[model samples]
Target: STGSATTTPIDSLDDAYITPVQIGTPAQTLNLDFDTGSSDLWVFSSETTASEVDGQTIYTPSKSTTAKLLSGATWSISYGDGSSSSGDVYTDTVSVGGLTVTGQAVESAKKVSSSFTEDSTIDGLLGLAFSTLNTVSPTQQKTFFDNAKASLDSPVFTADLGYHAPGTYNFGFIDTTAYTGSITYTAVSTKQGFWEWTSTGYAVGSGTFKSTSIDGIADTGTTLLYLPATVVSAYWAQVSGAKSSSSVGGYVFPCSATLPSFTFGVGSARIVIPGDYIDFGPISTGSSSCFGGIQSSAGIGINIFGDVALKAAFVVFNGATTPTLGFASK
Candidate 1:
């Protein structure tokens, strides 16, 4: 029985074989897919090509600000998008929120894809989710925390998700201003970054919303929020004179209408997603347009409130100390 490439187990079958597969030795490198959808960090190596990446940072052991090789070992990784990249193993210095660690294990891939080729915009993913999904295992997997633990300030990492600009998410370090003030906190799912969430309902023009009950996880990698169809519809209904647009790839609206405030419940805790988020920039003068939250995705299940939702508040992911997540005023 001979073998063919098709016979091999693909690491990522969703991406165009463009993602990465397995973790190589010298595992002290940064390999992260920091999405609110799921939390996992993995990387490619020098074997990964420059024609595809050009001058993107390659984990050169000697050049590393700090790193080491794991006795001529190899590692790879795959993604849900069916994309894959593989390469050699190495260890070096890495950081999060100005917290640095040396001799951290990492997998470095050489060949990358055009989608990943955009170096100027998105350098590399820093999974800000949970540490449980880290890749610190000896044979199969090893978590990022397992490596960073040796050097991090508190043996923990915190993610401060922010809305410094509209529709953009800035990470690392908590913006204390947002977490201050009177706020309630909730217990998070221990195994994953999924936070137990509830909404008090949406408000507009000084009108209060009836108590609405919904449960969902807060994701950042995803750019938009996904709620049950009924909840989505009701949310948009309250935003006066709201309009829908496919131009912004759905969910984006150009409205001056008074959007209502939506309160989320975490255990007994609650926080509000500011109204301005519900309304996009001005398209014209006079009447403001509104964006609707209700989206049709019967084909895809599971409610997702993406990066847009995280902006209005302060999110603290506790991986090193208490293994707790804190949501405060932002």
Candidate 2:
């Protein structure tokens, strides 16, 4: 009945999540992630006949009481993590949070690779990053917000992600009063199919790290930060109690200890990622201590600020008005 769901259209083929569409037709039901980095829908389909491995959640058209396939559509997508998949064209009446969009074209995977099949689930992602990233046509641009805006109790939408767990996918208005101050939002740049953004260098406790500058995108579908290694090491240096241990493959810190306030400078704006974010409770099985955030690289020139960043504020990638993004109170 309800479920879960990347970005921008990869200018070149060397990217993940190609132009795919996944919908819940009258007979077929597919689960997908609503990604903003790109605007496309890819699904796990019955047509993915070749793969023996149980990769992303595949939709059984046979199981659905309502289903239809598109005659002239084909798609394949790749991600920064080196995962890839391809499928045929299909269309269905898709539903999101109960609202349905008719004539939704979906990509059915004929082949799903090992990396993609294991890490990602629920058919494919429902891309909502930006219009530039959308696979839908100029005459017909469809997204969860575009459809639900009229039906929802509130005009806004939010992603209430849980710590180290499948976060709650909440629709409609978000409780703006949950946090301290009014949110300072940045404008969205539609030149690229990503929620491209700039943040003030991170601040911990009362200390701030300004060693390196960060220019990238903020993605809710992902879980970690892809920072340059040099900047990552410098950030840890500021945290007296925060240590980088190899056991976790990243920096692990104690959650309870009193620490300084860390701030991320975004041009004239400053966003302080709190300590709770620094040491989110460990949810992993064997991890001695799970890191609240990670410092990796945006090897492909596309850096994604995932759930670790999205959970902190209400972000908007509004393309209808212009190639701009807005952030408001949660």
Candidate 3:
């Protein structure tokens, strides 16, 4: 069978896409961030401290007859942004986009970092990565997708992330109508538990495309695109007032400056990102300075094709023996 869901942007953060998910038997619905960067299906639950609970809804496992405790099992996860959560485990019915997985492992949060507690909109995270990355102790747990794949008509999913608009995530099938042109495919290296790959080269605007190979990951969970310092510098040089801002901790430029487009090479395809998307809004409300949507990933050892890059293209995450990524203009 097939499943699909719409992901809405949260405020003007442009950081993540939120989707509704049903957990437990009676169906305690919660808004979750569908993240492809990590694995572990976790949620804010009755186990969470009352003081830590903000306006977010919690999952009451006791209310569902299908909820079964996974004794001696626990999970702790930390994101690249420093957000963290730790909790015990429960096997329950978890449904997403009408695709239900019975006896799915659900990590119920008992403690969460301030980053998660303060974000009232996101109740939990539904990991879309491979199950090998699951953080559950004593026994690794399968993701909702992994559990449901056997029953799916196709072992693939597509992400159509949009800017300031709602996008769709399709499971078990690819909607050819959602993208333009032909899909350019590339093999991925999942050695690091991510959809990692290398770009043949990149360019700023219509400039000559460089031939240097830059390794990066296509991460839906990440907010901004991250490249190397050299690549970032080259791209910013085309903008009149763009400069590195230690105060802002990255690069910033005049809000009124007209920016150039950025392009990356994936196989034979040259995916272009428009300049408007590179301007990540203002640093602050009514501020004259705007933060760049692309920054240096020098220390991180790999670049990240985050929301900014993904929004420009339609992506297919194929779960074959060697998972491949297919990209096309949106």
Candidate 4:
């Protein structure tokens, strides 16, 4: 079996990528952010406090004839921004593209943070990482991808993130035409329950590549690229007006400054992130200063290869006996 889904940005900043999915007998379609950083298929629902919901769609388990409450099951998770959500669990039929999973864990949000409520565009999150990261206690559940892996023609999924455009996510067989050049495959470590890998090196602009090992996770849920402090400084140094702003809380620069492209190694292969993409965008509405797409990961504990890096190439999460990741230019 194979499945395909289209993902689009909620707003111009490419805040988050959302994909349409259906749940239950009546089929409640929700636009969910498919995250590779976490493992929990959670959503906003009628079970959530009424005041917590704003303009987002809510999934009502009671309306679904196939929805069954998982006895004594509960879950909770905290995001990087400090926002949190927690609730009881339910098992129901979930359909994505042409793939459907019966008894897929659907965590209904009982309480949500202010950040979640303010983001009216996202209805929920569909995690695509390993089930080992699941937050459910007493009776942990499998992620949607894990449960659907066996039924797929190939136990793999590919992500093609776009810049200000729609992207595609494919499960099962690889779509050869979606990328350019042969894919460069590398080993992935799921010990930390993430698609973590070591990048061979990096290059700023047209300079020489550094033969340094940079270990990080490939996260589709996150919005920006984060690297070691020195590595991030090297890239920003090439820009004319870049500076670490205490007020802005990150590296920012003049919007008109010419930014340098960034390149990272995937084995012997290199994937280049265009300079324009690194500029990110203005710090605020009508502001002349902009935020840097690449930031220091010193405080983040581990580096993260997020949308800023992923958008420049095609990525594949190979769910094999021994997992691996594939990177290809497009």
Better candidate number, 2 or 3, judged by TM-score: 3
Off by over 4 Å in 4: none
Tens digit per residue, CA lDDT, model 1, 76-137: 44543344455555665554423444554565665555656654233244444554454333
Clashes of each: 72, 56, 0, 0
Question: Considering summed lDDT, which 10 consecutive residues are worst modelled in model 2?
Answer: 6-15
Off by over 4 Å in 3: none
After superposition, the stretches of candidate 2 with alpha carbons farther than 4 Å from their true spots are 1-30, 50-57, 62-66, 119-121, 134-157, 164-180, 208-213, 239-262, 265-270, 276-292, 328-330
Q: Sort by lDDT, best first: what order? A: 4, 3, 2, 1
lDDT of each: 0.47, 0.55, 0.90, 0.93
TM per candidate comes to 0.65, 0.71, 0.97, 0.99
Please provide, for model 2 over 224-256, each residue's C-alpha lDDT reduced to its tens digit, 9 standing for 90 to 100.
Answer: 666666666666676656776666656766654
- After TM-score superposition, the amount by which residue 260's alpha carbon in candidate 4 deviates from its true location, in angstroms, is 1.3
lDDT of 2 at 323: 46
Pairs of residues at least 3 apart in sequence or in different chains that clash in candidate 3: none
Q: Write the per-residue lDDT of candidate 4 for residues 1-330, one digit (tens) a residue.
A: 999999999988787899999999889999999999999999999999999999999999999999999999999999876888999999999999888999999999999999999999999999988999999989889999999999999999999999888899899989999999999999999999999999999999999999899999999999999999999989889888799998997899998888889999999999999988776688888999999899989888999999999999999999999999999999
Q: What is the TM-score ranking, best to worst? A: 4, 3, 2, 1
TM-score of 1: 0.65
Per-residue lDDT over 1-330 for candidate 3, one digit per residue giving the tens place of the 0 to 100 score: 888989888767587889999898789999999888888989999999888899999999999989999999999999887789999999999888888889999999999999888989999999988888999999999988888888888988899998889999888899999999999999899898888888889989989989888888888888899999999999999889899988898999999998899999888788899898887778999999999999998777778999989988999998877799999997
